[PDB]
């Protein structure tokens, strides 16, 4: 009962992964609300529940399948289904907790984690910073297996949390930033897994602030700069939407145009 997109790591290519992320972006928003050439995701206020989520069914060479659910108002993974079980991050407010009761209503076993999907907490559970968790088509293959065998009781929590970290960056963050999408394309192109460097980490960390900066900007000029980092960790300051046009693909709704 929500729109579904399929992606398989089996035989995946730069093109198959790019096609996947481009499909994800187009399901997340129509692109009708654009500010300074960057699409805005739908405002959660007044959004019908039947339009609130999209699904991404992931499959791997082992022929295991899991179905991620993404909230269209923020592009993030809110939970997933494996077989006859569904799992959801702990939402931040009661209203989102009501929203997710509409996901995977057919499954017999439904669980809410005692933790939300924020990186600080996922990293603690995983026992590693994102800096130490390789991304790529191999990591995604393994994360699909981990998520699926979490539903049999096999996969334990650190490996699951690490697998969420992989999925969230390769799907949700790749959707929000064409820069991160490009980072994953390079890993797939050269068939090489590697962890994200600070240029990726600080984009992921600043998506909400960047969204606010842009939407509240004066003709594109940020009221205050936003600090990022280059690949070597050195400071990079953003003053203007202009440099973000090739970087960020989607913003969360923060105000009306």
């Amino acid at each position, epitope marked *: 009962q929500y729109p579904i997109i399929n992606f398989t790591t089996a035989g995946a290519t730069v093109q198959s992964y790019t096609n996947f992320i481009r499909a994800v972006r187009g399901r997340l928003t129509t692109g009708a609300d654009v500010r300074h050439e960057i699409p805005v995701l739908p405002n959660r206020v007044g959004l019908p529940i039947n339009q609130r989520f999209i699904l991404v069914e992931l499959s791997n060479h082992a022929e295991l399948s899991v179905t991620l659910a993404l909230d269209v108002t923020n592009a993030y993974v809110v939970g997933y289904r494996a077989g006859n079980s569904a799992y959801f991050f702990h939402p931040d407010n009661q209203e989102d907790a009501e929203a997710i009761t509409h996901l995977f209503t057919d499954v017999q076993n439904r669980y809410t984690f005692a933790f939300g999907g924020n990186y600080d907490r996922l990293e603690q559970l995983a026992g590693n910073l994102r800096e130490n968790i390789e991304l790529g088509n191999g990591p995604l293959e393994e994360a699909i297996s981990a998520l699926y065998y979490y539903s049999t009781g096999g996969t334990q929590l650190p490996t699951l949390a690490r697998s969420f970290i992989i999925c969230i960056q390769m799907i949700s963050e790749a959707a929000r930033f064409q820069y991160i999408e490009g980072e994953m394309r390079t890993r797939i192109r050269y068939n090489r897994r590697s962890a994200p460097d600070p240029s990726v980490i600080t984009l992921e960390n600043s998506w909400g602030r960047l969204s606010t900066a842009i939407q509240e900007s004066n003709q594109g000029a940020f009221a205050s700069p936003i600090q990022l980092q280059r690949r070597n960790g050195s*400071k990079f300051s953003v003053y203007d939407v202009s440099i973000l046009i090739p970087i960020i693909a989607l913003m969360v709704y923060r105000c009306a145009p």
Partner: nanobody
Amino acid sequence: VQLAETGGGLAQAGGSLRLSCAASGSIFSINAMGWYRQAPGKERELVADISGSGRTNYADSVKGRFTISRDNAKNTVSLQMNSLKPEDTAVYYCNVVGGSYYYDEYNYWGQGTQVTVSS
């Protein structure tokens, strides 16, 4: 979310100060905490921050001099400022970001503490 800043104040060049910030409230998906600083006619700059998982960043000019630490049980961060320079004079602001569905769904600032270092 409420932020309580303490510490700071006046110091001599080469002296030491310590800042601390304790968060409370709707805090379950809290992420990075840190300190920005702003001098009277200058741009705000990140001084240091720290994630609940222990990642620490520092402005280049404070490395080897300032150290940040965090206690997740109390949602508190401290900034130990050694070998203070006149250039460290500024209003220092604690910042907390969090969110279950993205890193910085909320972004709260402290009131600001003055730090003044004589040359």
